[PDB]
Write a protein that binds this ligand. Structure first.
Ligand SMILES: *[C@@](C)(CO)[C@](*)(O)[C@H](Cc1ccccc1)NC(=O)[C@H](Cc1ccc(OC)cc1)NC(=O)[C@H](C)NC(=O)CN1CCOCC1
Ligand SMILES: *[C@@](C)(CO)[C@](*)(O)[C@H](Cc1ccccc1)NC(=O)[C@H](Cc1ccc(OC)cc1)NC(=O)[C@H](C)NC(=O)CN1CCOCC1
Ligand SMILES: *[C@@](C)(CO)[C@](*)(O)[C@H](Cc1ccccc1)NC(=O)[C@H](Cc1ccc(OC)cc1)NC(=O)[C@H](C)NC(=O)CN1CCOCC1
Ligand SMILES: [Mg+2]
Ligand SMILES: [Mg+2]
Ligand SMILES: [Mg+2]
Ligand SMILES: [Mg+2]
Lengths: 233, 195, 212, 222, 222, 196, 204, 195, 196
């Protein structure tokens, strides 16, 4: 039995025609205190997978070490470690999913919501979710925390079902993700302006973007708003 | 309090009520009459929370007797039961509700028919051929379902009632010290002394 | 649930209802509340369903291992005690069980053991277990005799379940009858309460309160 | 305090014919008032002509199916590739479920297939292992909506022969695969209308002697 | 519930879904959440259904009496003041979450009220269980100087977001447009994107299927 | 909330963020927490939105009725009416109010009223959840008899930090200037204050 | 101790072609114990029919209350109350007891005598009006009734066909609920004749 | 379970134990023997938590019988009572304690004296002339204080015991369905069939 | 507690107050919250006195055994051992530890370890109950590559404010300077820092 202390907020993601995009802000909250601002919550595994983590940061750092150790262990006695027998997104996910469910079954969970985004060896897009309860699910768009409530509605307007994936380009997809991050900054009280974004493409590979900022924000209309009803001046 | 039964037959209503008053680990009394005569042809048995039962029974009794004097007329069992139900229906949303369950056995002189009404503390009224309150029903109802006929005589009703008391005495955990039986018919109310 | 079992001249009658509820919701009308432990032993369901099922199936495995090792039929006493000692180990853990272990051997004759998740083990002539046990008891007690016929005993058990099926909201569906003899149990069919009620009402004259 | 259970919603439905059996289930996955996935299957082919679904808490549901699938695999290794009969699978699942009697799998389980006489078979389980073979069973969030409809349309309950004074019942008969699928589709569209956790899509797995076939139908997405 | 309000050039528009729930069950598939306080002051309500209706009617009744007493068309701030003071008095026990909008001699207005009696002002607002799905759309697509047709589009799009993504919202979209110098136009079922598909089968029973015990004519006359 | 009021040479300035929260969800990102109870008597609102709103309305009613009979009320009088409501209804209220006003005799004045309903007259006052993070900063940087431009910078820099650290605070920084000249509303957007 | 499921019971209403149907079970119990198999839950005031599920003491009390109110209505208005008007009276009456409510699930059914239009409506315990073209359900087997009605129902059914549909909806819903059943009654209502039929159902 | 009594007289120990087995609102059995013979001249009656009682009684019985076979010798009542007390004394600090109260009536053949031991579930042993467990004591003890003499015969002891059962049947709330009476003396253990 | 550690040009400086409380009673007004786990690796302790003490002792034991086998440990290594204890025993600990050390390769380094057991490497770190009041101040006033005298003034002024506002903090301001030159202990009394 736990309670989360230092926490990370929404992780959002979606599929597009050639790959997957995933994003998460760089904040480590300590309750209402916005304590840490340099926290990277997207962690690449190889050149074909990105694990996005929300929830408890101490448990996130534990999961980082496990993934780091998984790459080391896979390389042992493996001449094809950088080829056919490299770590797939599906392998990395199933490993984490196993751990998350085992920990919940011992009444001592890793207090996280995790999204594993990547591209398989045959070119297929991989995007699947897992959390502290061991619950797993996949969808064209996936998001955690507030992202589930606010991002998914926006991302589902682009890709509403399977057949919309080939029709969606990387430009259109990234635009939707960056827009979703702005909306979350408007509305999530435990979000920051600074964030990271990762694109895993079947052709161009892994593109990791750091130190992005929410921009083109609408605040100007605030000056006209006066009082809460009957106030004029 | 605990066991109160009622059986409506062809020409009468029969009420059986347990004699025990227990308070604690002690049976304080074994000859308690858990009933009041509301009018010459209407009888009400009662069971529930201590104090509340008699207080309620006597309060109803006073009201019906007041009506009788004012109008020089006896209210029908249906009318009395409706009055009693409304009083309990008020009670349930009071600061401190009466926790009393009742059976009203009466003979309607205008219809020349016996009538049995079962009313719980919430104010839930039902007319029945046979009725019971508390755990008693869990034994008696199925027994009456089997053996009861609508055209029975008073003597047949008493034998049917003996069958119920025997079953209760066999399977009930608590000693309720037998029952006082009373019959309501065209000639009014009378008590069976040897049961 | 309503289950009963009683000893008489012709052996044992076992009768059960068929309903299973989860709160007010009727989950099943076709449940089997008699377990066929082996061709000579029967057990009844009341309380936990999986438990009764799981552990009386297990009991049958223990009874089979007994007669393999001892080259002799297991006694009703021994079989019932294997179950009661087992549930006693689990006492506190939350097992829910109320069962009649019924059988007929040479040394014992017809025998019924009430076994409980509290660890209670009682030998007896008549037992009724379930939410509608009190209704069944009323019919049994007023009509039971040791010198009943197999035909009349079967009916009494059937009629007693019907009584409970009617009044008890958590009992009904159908009635399963069994008759246990020394050469084994004999199944006496599934009887839908919907059809049985009207049949009994007319032929017996009972249930005059109900309009048909 | 940490709560190890959750509710992933959804609903499932199994019907048995004369020489076939269907096991249907909606493809929606939810937590609270959010949709997790519009297409997340929970009806699985487990081999040996056995289809299975464990609806309720998905994590427990996936764990159970995974374990049973593995049970089938080891049955082949240990018993000379013998086919696991539907009745044997049912008993095995009871031991899987009851194995966690005091920390249960929060799932209503249903399996479907053909018995050893080639006739359609549906078995249904409670969370802790009690099971029973039936012609008909709905499970999950909308079970209470669908099940009484099945009683009426599959088992012809409360239906009497016209003009017989309610004395002769409507006779029981097997339904065609075409007739069964109609009832499944109407059951789920009706459940989708009145239950918020039911919708998005319907996936049916049909089991005949020839194998396991699939059919998919859209459901309302609101 | 999902409800929204959007300001535009010469007025204000409000919209709402048409789902009503008791637990996970859809009680009403086409209820009316848009409420008339006065001819040109309309209210969208979320929360306890009876409370949003009762409180909107009471204030509406008093607004009419006030309008007759003062010989003036009612103002939105009067309805706002009367609603919040009523809701505050009951310390949140009257669970009404309202979006109040309308036009009056002062101009066009848009407010929100919470159950405990707090009010907000804005150009775009959303309340209810699907307010986050709606607000996501509003935050993405809203701009200053919207036209009438643009505001209706934005509003209904925000409601649709709730309909599809929120399980507490569904069915249809109701709209009410309140423009300055014009009559308010109430657009009941402005969109109906959740029409039930044709059923696979007719369940019309053969006459005489139901068994009957008694028949009798009921007297409704004097 | 993060709110504050600061007296200076020409009068007094009130300052506030614009974030309203229901849990971690921001119900309103452009809230106006600075409210008028009289021509040149204003207040900052923190705590329960419904409570502070109901109180402010009652005070505005009292001061309007005061003005009708006895002319312009003092800032102290306004604070006294606030106190009276907050103290007598302390069991049913969650309101932390800062009262600020401009007399011509008394110049700028600031009264803070915490949860209990006590009154405290101060040179400057800070309040709300985000104020905890700027006690150190404000104490080191406040000076008496500052200019308008200095006081605006003091509030802007202070609330900027309060906003930066407090998740319950954010949006725009509204301000209201109270001097003999009149009433002036100021607004400051994220793109400006965040990079201070 | 949940007031709405102590006694048990159900009510369902449907519309047809120039007709309406309202039906109810006959059970009254005290949790597991079945007490009465004659407890009707449908009442009428003139041509306006009202069904009420829930706590039985409140069912009885409200019937008595609406008889009281409709009788005064008729004396003052010099005409029978209509279904649309009566629906509003029920809603008002229930909301009057907002913070101490009657634990009931009422259902109004009837044909407007002026316009001839079939009308049905439902309420929650607190007064919220649920109007419907097709059907209203209420009681301890409301989930079951929702599932039966949503599949079995079709528009513009003739009185004789509508009877079969509503009856099968109630019977099969009741049989999957422990606290409902023990007999049933169906009212078929036309413009100027009303037929009442008691159904044969399983008595467990 | 419920009523267990014990009386030590001049030449014997008499144990009376109620026959009822109640489960809920149902008396499941009315002929239950709440006792086990530990050895030819030692008898133990028991009352308490369901299941635990018999399980404990039989476990003790097995141990004493094992001792008898091993040593070809009967343990004294004092020795048996000390063994039983220690088992209950261990039990009380276990994960799940036996909730069983016992009376041990025995005849010491070496001393030629009857002996009665009362032991509660905590392991609280006392030798007494007359003993009881549960609510029974609240009626019987004062009655025996008055009527008991140490030099009484077995027949006088049975009459004294009848006096107790009559008082319990009069004042106890629950129907315990009479008692099975057993006598322990120099000639061993025998049951009184007509009580 | 109020504690902090700040990196600068020549290395790193740790700082702390001296107040230990059991409720509102000050059990020790001259506490030493800066503790040595290695020659030039020190830590600031906040939270439970018994927990942080037990942890620090175990770490000192681990680093002593590390030194015996593998020579001088890195500051990161020391922080890793602290984390390992704090994370794995998170259910039974209340410890907020700041680890600070001086390598010759890595110069000054600061790692903060909050309640959960997470690790965060920072230019400077603040912690303890009194740190809440100086987030605003410290953020505005911190600069990288400060001098020794500037860093001492930064810590002194910061903790002075933390002490001023936090009742749970007070007494003397202890400091420990970690550079290539060696280890230097500094102390500052109320009469000096209070009137800053
Ligand atoms: C969406 C559907 C929330 O899910 C809306 O808020 C909607 C608003 C609405 C509906 C119809 C007409 C106007 C406005 N709310 C509901 O449909 C509401 C949901 C709800 C249920 C229970 C609540 O408990 C505090 C709060 C909201 N449904 C109802 O009010 C239904 C009709 N009635 C009941 O559930 C009966 N409840 C009412 C509250 O008191 C206890 C009994
Ligand atoms: C910051 C954001 C947090 O303290 C401010 O104090 C802010 C002040 C404010 C807000 C709007 C307009 C003017 C001034 N307070 C809030 O935004 C406030 C947070 C709060 C709620 C309840 C409290 O105790 C009763 C204390 C603080 N938010 C609200 O009042 C919102 C609109 N409503 C709710 O959170 C619903 N509450 C009602 C009270 O009961 C709990 C649920
Ligand atoms: C400031 C004063 C308050 O947070 C510091 O964190 C300070 C840190 C410190 C103290 C001494 C030496 C080095 C560092 N903490 C305390 O003084 C601490 C306060 C505290 C106690 C318990 C806590 O949770 C378990 C958190 C903070 N004081 C103590 O530990 C004192 C000596 N003991 C007690 O208060 C007795 N406690 C023991 C734990 O259970 C509650 C009763
Ligand atoms: Mg029944
Ligand atoms: Mg939806
Ligand atoms: Mg400790
Ligand atoms: Mg101090």
């Amino acid at each position: 039995t736990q309670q989360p202390i230092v926490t990370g907020t929404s992780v959002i993601s979606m599929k597009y025609d050639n790959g997957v995009i995933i994003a998460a802000d760089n904040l480590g909250s300590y309750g209402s205190l916005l304590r840490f601002n340099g926290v990277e919550r997207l962690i690449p595994v190889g050149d074909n997978t990105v694990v996005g983590i929300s929830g408890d940061i101490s448990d996130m750092q534990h999961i980082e070490r496990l993934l780091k150790d998984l790459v080391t262990e896979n390389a042992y006695d493996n001449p094809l470690a950088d080829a056919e027998e490299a770590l797939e997104p599906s392998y990395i996910f199933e490993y984490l999913a196993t751990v998350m469910y085992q920990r919940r079954s011992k009444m001592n969970p890793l207090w996280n919501a995790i999204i594993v985004a990547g591209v398989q060896s045959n070119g297929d897009q991989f995007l699947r979710y897992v959390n502290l309860l061991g619950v797993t699910y996949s969808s064209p768009t996936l998001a955690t925390g507030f992202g589930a409530h606010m991002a998914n509605p926006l991302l589902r307007k682009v890709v509403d079902r399977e057949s919309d994936i080939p029709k969606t380009t990387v430009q259109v997809a990234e635009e939707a993700i960056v827009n979703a991050m702005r909306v979350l900054y408007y509305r999530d009280a435990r979000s920051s302006r600074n964030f990271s974004l990762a694109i895993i493409d079947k052709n161009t590979g892994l593109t990791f973007k750091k130190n992005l900022q929410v921009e083109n924000m609408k605040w100007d209309f605030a000056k006209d708003i006066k009082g809460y009803g009957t106030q004029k001046i | 309090m605990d066991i109160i039964l009622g059986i409506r037959v062809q020409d009468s209503v029969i009420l059986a009520s347990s004699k025990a008053v227990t308070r604690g680990i002690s049976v304080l009394k074994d000859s308690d009459d858990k009933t009041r005569q509301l009018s010459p042809h209407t009888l009400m048995s009662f069971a529930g929370e201590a104090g509340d039962t008699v207080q309620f029974a006597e309060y109803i009794q006073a009201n019906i007797q007041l009506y009788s004097i004012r109008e020089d007329y006896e209210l029908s069992p249906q009318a009395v039961s409706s009055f009693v139900r409304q009083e309990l229906a008020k009670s349930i949303r009071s600061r401190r509700p009466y926790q009393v369950n009742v059976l009203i056995g009466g003979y309607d002189k205008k219809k020349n028919k016996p009538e049995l009404y079962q009313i719980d503390y919430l104010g839930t009224k039902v007319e029945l051929p046979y009725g019971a309150h508390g755990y008693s029903g869990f034994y008696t109802f199925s027994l009456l379902d089997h053996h009861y006929r609508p055209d029975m005589t008073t003597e047949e009703g008493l034998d049917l009632l003996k069958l119920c008391v025997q079953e209760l005495e066999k399977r009930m955990p608590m000693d309720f010290k037998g029952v006082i039986v009373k019959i309501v018919d065209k000639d009014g109310i009378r008590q069976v002394d040897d049961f | 649930t309503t289950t009963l079992a009683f000893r008489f001249q012709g052996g044992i009658i076992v009768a059960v209802d068929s309903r299973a509820t989860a709160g007010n919701w009727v989950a099943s009308q076709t449940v089997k509340k008699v377990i066929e432990i082996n061709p000579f032993l029967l057990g009844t369901m009341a309380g936990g369903a999986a438990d009764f099922q799981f552990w009386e199936t297990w009991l049958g495995s223990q009874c089979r291992l007994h007669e393999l090792r001892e080259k002799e039929r297991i006694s009703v006493a021994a079989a019932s005690k294997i179950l009661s000692n087992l549930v006693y180990q689990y006492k506190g853990a939350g097992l829910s069980m109320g069962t009649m272990i019924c059988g007929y051997t040479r040394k014992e004759g017809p025998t019924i053991y009430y076994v409980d998740s509290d660890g209670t083990r009682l030998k007896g002539d008549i037992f009724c277990v379930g939410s509608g046990q009190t209704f069944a008891y009323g019919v049994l007690d007023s009509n039971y005799k040791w010198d009943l016929s197999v035909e009349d005993a079967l009916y009494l058990g059937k009629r007693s379940i019907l009584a409970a099926a009617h009044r008890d909201a958590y009992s009904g569906g159908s009635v399963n009858l069994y008759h246990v003899t020394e050469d084994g149990w004999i199944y006496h069919g599934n009887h839908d309460v919907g059809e049985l009620f009207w049949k009994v009402k007319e032929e017996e004259g009972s249930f005059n309160n109900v309009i048909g | 305090q940490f709560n190890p259970y959750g509710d992933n919603g959804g609903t499932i439905l199994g019907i048995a014919g004369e020489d076939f059996a269907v096991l249907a289930g909606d493809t929606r996955n939810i937590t609270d008032y959010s949709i997790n996935s519009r297409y997340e299957p929970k009806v699985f082919d487990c081999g040996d002509n056995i289809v299975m679904s464990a609806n309720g808490f998905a994590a427990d549901g996936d764990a159970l199916v995974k374990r049973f699938k593995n049970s089938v695999k080891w049955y082949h290794f240990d018993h000379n590739d013998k086919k696991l009969s539907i009745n044997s699978a049912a008993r095995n699942i009871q031991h899987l479920l009851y194995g966690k009697r005091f920390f249960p799998y929060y799932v209503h389980t249903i399996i479907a297939g053909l018995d050893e006489d080639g006739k359609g078979a549906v078995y249904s389980f409670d969370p802790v292992g009690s099971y029973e073979r039936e012609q008909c069973r709905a499970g999950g969030a909308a079970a209470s909506l669908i099940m009484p409809f099945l009683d009426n349309q599959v088992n012809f309950k409360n239906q009497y022969e016209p003009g017989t004074n309610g004395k002769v019942k409507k006779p029981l008969k097997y339904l065609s695969v075409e007739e069964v699928i109609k009832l499944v589709r109407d059951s789920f569209t009706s459940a989708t209308e009145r239950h918020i956790q039911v919708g998005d899509g319907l996936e049916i797995l049909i089991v005949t002697k020839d194998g396991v076939r699939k059919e998919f139908y859209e459901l309302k997405r609101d | 519930t999902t409800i929204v309000g959007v300001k535009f050039n010469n007025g204000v528009v409000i919209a709402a879904d048409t789902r009503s729930t008791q637990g996970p069950i859809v009680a009403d598939k086409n209820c009316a959440k848009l409420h008339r306080i006065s001819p040109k002051i309309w209210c969208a309500g979320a929360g306890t259904a009876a409370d949003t209706e009762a409180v909107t009617q009471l204030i509406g009744s008093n607004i009419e009496l006030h309008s007759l007493y003062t010989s003036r068309e009612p103002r939105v701030v009067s309805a706002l003041q009367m609603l919040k003071q009523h809701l505050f008095k009951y310390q949140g026990h009257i669970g009404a979450y309202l979006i109040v909008a309308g036009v009056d001699p002062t101009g066009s207005h848009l407010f929100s009220i919470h159950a405990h009696g707090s009010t907000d002002v804005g150009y775009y607002l959303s309340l209810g269980s699907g307010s986050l799905a709606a607000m996501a759309v509003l935050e993405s697509h809203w701009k200053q100087d919207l036209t009438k047709e643009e505001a209706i589009k934005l509003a209904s799009d925000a409601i649709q977001a709730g309909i599809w993504n929120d399980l507490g919202s569904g069915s249809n979209v109701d709209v009410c447009v309140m423009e300055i110098g014009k009559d308010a136009e109430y657009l009941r079922n402005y969109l109906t994107p959740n029409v039930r598909e044709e059923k696979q089968k007719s369940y019309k029973f053969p006459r005489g299927t139901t068994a009957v015990l008694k028949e009798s004519i009921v007297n409704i006359c004097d | 909330t993060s709110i504050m009021a600061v007296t200076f040479k020409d009068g007094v300035i009130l300052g506030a963020d614009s974030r309203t929260t229901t849990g971690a969800y921001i119900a309103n990102r452009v809230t106006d927490k600075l409210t008028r109870v009289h021509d040149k008597i204003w207040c900052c609102r923190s705590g329960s939105a419904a409570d502070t709103q109901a109180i402010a309305d009652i005070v505005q009613y009292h001061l309007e009725l005061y003005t009708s009979q006895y002319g312009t009320p003092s800032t102290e009088t306004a604070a006294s009416v606030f106190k009276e409501l907050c103290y007598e209804n302390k069991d049913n209220l969650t309101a932390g109010i800062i009262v600020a006003g401009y007399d011509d005799k008394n110049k700028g004045e600031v009264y803070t009223i915490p949860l209990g309903g006590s009154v405290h007259k101060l040179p400057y006052a800070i309040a709300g959840s985000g104020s905890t993070f700027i006690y150190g900063y404000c104490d080191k940087n406040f000076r008496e008899n500052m200019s308008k431009e200095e006081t605006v910078d003091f509030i802007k820099h202070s609330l900027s930090q309060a906003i930066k650290w407090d998740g319950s605070s954010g949006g725009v920084i509204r301000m209201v200037v109270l001097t003999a000249a009149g009433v002036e509303r100021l607004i400051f957007y994220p793109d400006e204050y965040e990079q201070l | 101790s949940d007031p709405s499921s102590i006694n048990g019971g159900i009510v369902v209403a449907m519309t047809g072609k120039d007709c309406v149907a309202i039906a109810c079970d006959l059970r009254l119990g005290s949790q597991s114990l079945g007490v009465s198999n004659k407890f009707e839950k449908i009442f009428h005031y003139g041509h306006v029919f009202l069904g009420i599920t829930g706590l039985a003491t409140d069912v009885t009390t409200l019937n008595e209350m609406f008889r009281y109110k409709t009788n005064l209505y008729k004396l003052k208005e010099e005409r029978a109350i209509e279904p649309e008007t009566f629906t509003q009276l029920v809603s008002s009456s229930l909301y009057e007891r907002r913070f101490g409510p009657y634990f009931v699930g009422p259902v109004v059914a009837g044909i407007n005598s002026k316009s001839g239009k079939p009308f049905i409506a439902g309420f929650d315990l607190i007064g919220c009006i649920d109007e419907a073209k097709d059907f209203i359900v209420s009681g301890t087997a409301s989930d079951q009734l929702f599932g039966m009605c949503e599949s079995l129902y079709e528009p513009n059914l003739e009185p004789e066909d509508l009877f079969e549909t509503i009856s099968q909806a109630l019977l099969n819903a009741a049989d999957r609920d422990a606290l409902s059943g023990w007999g049933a009654v169906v009212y078929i209502i036309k413009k100027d004749e009303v037929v009442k039929r008691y159904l044969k159902m399983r008595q467990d």
